[PDB]
Design a protein around this ligand. Structure first.
Ligand SMILES: [Mn+2]
Ligand SMILES: [Mn+2]
Length: 508
C-alpha cells in the first residue's frame, strides 16, 4: 500500500531576494535536498489564479479550497469582474430574460444595491455594466435606488459616487436616481423590519422625504448631521412633486449586491409572495423578474445571475469514490483547512476519510513557540504511515504562516527549520513505503518578514509556491496553479479526472 502524500508547508513562498527572507536565510537541507534530487516547479498561488482580484496575496482558506478543488474557485467580486472584463456579463441569460420582459411589457427596469467602490457587499462598477447593458439592449426606462454606504468606504463620500454615477448616465443615455436610502435602512441583517419597511415604502409606495435630486437629498441629509450610512429612505421627484419612479407590476429589478447577508431581508420582501413579516399594504408589486447577482439564501424566490459553484468532485470526493482511504491531519490552526476548506466548504467526512487533530500549543501569537505542534503532528503521521492505513494523506505544516505573521525574522527562521526537520521525517517515511510526496505551499509569508525599510512584515506574500514530486522520472509544467495540484494527484494515483475539475495535471 503505497502512500501518496500531499504536504502543505503553509506560509512558505519562493523568493529570490534574501533580505527579509526567513525561508532563504533558513538552513533547509531536507527541502534543498528534495528540490535538487526530484522534479520541481513553481506555482502561482495568487490573484485570479485562485479566484481573487489580481495582485492580491492568497490566504489559507482560498488556498486550501483551491488545492482540494482541482479548479479555480472564484470569489464573488472577482467572478463578476472577470465576466465584465471578458464580455460574458452581457450574454448572461438571467439579465437578458429580465430585460426582455420590460421591452414586451412596456415597463421599467430597476437597479438597486450598495452605491460605492467598497468591494465588500457590492461594487458600483457592477451597476455601471448593468447601465451599459440596458442602454445597449434599448430599454426605455432605468431607475436607480441608491443604497448608501459610508461603512466600506469613507463616511461622507456618497456624492463622489453619485457624481461617478451621473457620468455613467451621460455616456450611456439611460439611468435615473429614483430613491436614496442609507444602508442602515436597506442593509439591516438583524431582523429589524421597521427599518426595512421604511426603505421599502419609499420604493413601491413613494413615501418619505422628497428631493429634486440625489445630491439635494444628500446635501440636506448632511445638513442635519445625518450621513451616508444613516440617511433616511428618500424619494427623488420630478419638477412637479410626483415620484420619479415607484416599483410597479411587471417592472424588472436587479439587486446587484453579491454578498448574501445584509442583502437577504430586502430581497425577501420583493420575492417571497407569502411574506407576512411586516404588512406591505396593498400595492405589492408581483409577477416579477427579480434578479440577484448571486444566491443569497434558500429563503429568496427570484432569479440568480451568477449561481454558486456547486463544487462537486473535489480531491476528497474523487479518491473516496475510487474506494481509496484518506487522511486529513494538522494542528488546530490549520485543521479547518485540511478538512472543511480542502473538502470544498464541506463539514462532513467522505467515505474512507479519517481526520486527526493535534492540539496547537497553549500559546498567544506563536512566535514565542516557533515550533508550535509540528513534532507531535510529525510523530502521529509517521505512526499512521508505519501502520499502512491510508492511500492518500493530506498534511499541513502550519509553522511558517503562523510564526511568519510575527514579522520577526529569527523566530520565523526557527520555524522554517523546524518545518524543515519534520518534512525529512515525513518524506523518509513515505518513500520507505514506496509512495510519493507532493511538497507544496498554499501561499507565502515567511519569505517576506521585513519590508523595504526593515519594518515588521506581518502579512502573506504574493510570491510563487514550490512544488516537488518525489518520483524520479516525471517532467513538470512551469505555469502551474493550485487548481492543477488535485489533477496531478489523480495522475499519481491512476484514478480518472472528472469533468468538474477544470485544472490540468502538472506531469508532462
Ligand atoms: Mn495558509
Ligand atoms: Mn495566515
Amino acid at each position: 500500500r503505497k502512500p501518496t502524500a500531499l504536504i502543505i508547508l503553509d506560509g512558505f513562498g519562493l523568493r529570490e531576494e534574501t533580505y527579509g527572507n526567513a525561508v532563504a536565510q533558513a538552513k533547509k537541507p531536507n527541502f534543498d535536498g528534495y528540490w535538487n534530487k526530484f522534479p520541481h516547479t513553481t506555482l502561482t498561488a495568487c490573484g485570479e489564479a485562485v479566484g481573487l482580484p489580481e495582485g492580491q496575496m492568497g490566504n489559507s482558506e482560498v488556498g486550501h479550497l483551491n488545492i482540494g478543488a482541482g479548479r479555480i474557485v472564484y470569489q464573488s467580486l472577482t467572478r463578476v469582474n472577470v465576466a465584465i472584463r471578458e464580455g460574458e456579463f452581457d450574454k448572461n441569460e438571467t439579465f437578458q430574460s429580465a430585460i426582455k420582459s420590460v421591452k414586451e411589457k412596456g415597463t421599467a427596469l430597476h437597479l438597486f444595491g450598495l452605491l460605492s467602490d467598497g468591494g465588500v457587499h457590492s461594487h458600483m462598477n457592477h451597476m455601471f455594466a448593468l447601465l451599459r447593458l440596458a442602454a445597449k439592449e434599448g430599454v426605455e426606462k432605468v431607475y436607480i435606488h441608491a443604497f448608501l454606504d459610508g461603512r466600506d468606504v469613507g463616511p461622507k463620500t456618497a456624492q463622489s459616487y453619485i457624481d461617478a454615477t451621473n457620468e455613467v448616465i451621460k455616456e450611456t443615455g439611460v439611468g435615473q436616481f429614483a430613491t436614496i436610502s442609507g444602508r442602515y435602512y436597506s442593509m439591516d441583517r438583524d431582523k429589524r423590519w421597521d427599518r426595512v419597511e421604511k426603505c421599502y415604502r419609499a420604493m413601491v409606495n413613494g413615501e418619505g422625504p422628497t428631493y429634486k435630486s440625489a445630491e439635494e437629498c444628500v446635501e440636506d441629509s448632511y445638513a442635519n448631521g445625518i450621513y451616508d450610512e444613516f440617511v433616511l429612505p428618500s424619494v427623488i421627484v420630478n419638477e412637479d412633486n410626483t415620484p420619479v419612479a415607484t416599483i410597479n407590476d411587471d417592472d424588472a429589478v436587479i439587486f446587484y449586491n453579491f454578498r448574501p447577508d445584509r442583502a437577504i431581508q430586502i430581497a425577501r420582501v420583493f420575492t417571497n409572495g407569502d411574506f407576512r413579516e411586516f404588512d406591505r399594504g396593498e400595492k405589492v408589486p408581483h409577477i416579477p423578474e427579480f434578479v440577484c447577482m448571486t444566491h443569497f439564501s434558500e429563503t429568496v424566490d427570484g432569479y440568480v445571475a451568477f449561481k454558486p459553484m456547486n463544487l462537486d468532485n473535489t480531491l476528497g470526493e474523487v479518491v473516496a469514490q475510487a474506494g481509496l482511504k484518506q487522511l486529513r491531519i494538522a494542528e488546530t490552526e490549520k485543521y479547518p483547512h485540511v478538512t472543511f476548506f480542502f473538502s470544498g466548504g464541506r463539514e462532513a467526512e467522505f467515505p474512507g476519510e479519517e481526520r486527526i487533530l493535534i492540539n496547537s500549543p497553549k500559546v498567544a501569537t506563536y512566535d514565542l513557540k516557533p515550533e508550535m505542534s509540528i513534532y507531535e503532528v510529525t510523530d502521529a503521521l509517521v505512526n499512521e504511515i508505519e501502520n499502512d492505513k491510508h492511500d492518500v494523506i493530506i498534511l499541513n505544516f502550519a509553522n511558517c504562516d503562523m510564526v511568519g505573521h510575527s514579522g520577526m525574522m529569527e523566530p520565523t527562521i526557527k520555524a522554517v527549520e523546524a518545518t524543515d526537520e519534520c518534512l525529512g521525517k515525513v518524506v523518509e517515511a513515505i518513500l520507505a513505503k514506496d509512495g510519493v510526496a507532493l511538497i507544496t505551499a498554499d501561499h507565502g509569508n515567511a519569505d517576506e518578514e521585513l519590508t523595504s525599510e526593515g519594518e515588521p512584515m506581518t502579512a502573506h506574500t504574493t510570491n510563487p509556491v514550490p512544488f516537488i514530486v518525489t518520483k524520479n522520472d516525471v517532467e513538470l509544467r512551469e505555469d502551474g496553479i493550485l487548481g492543477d495540484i488535485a489533477p496531478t494527484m489523480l495522475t499519481l494515483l491512476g484514478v480518472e479526472q472528472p469533468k468538474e475539475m477544470t485544472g490540468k495535471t502538472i506531469i508532462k
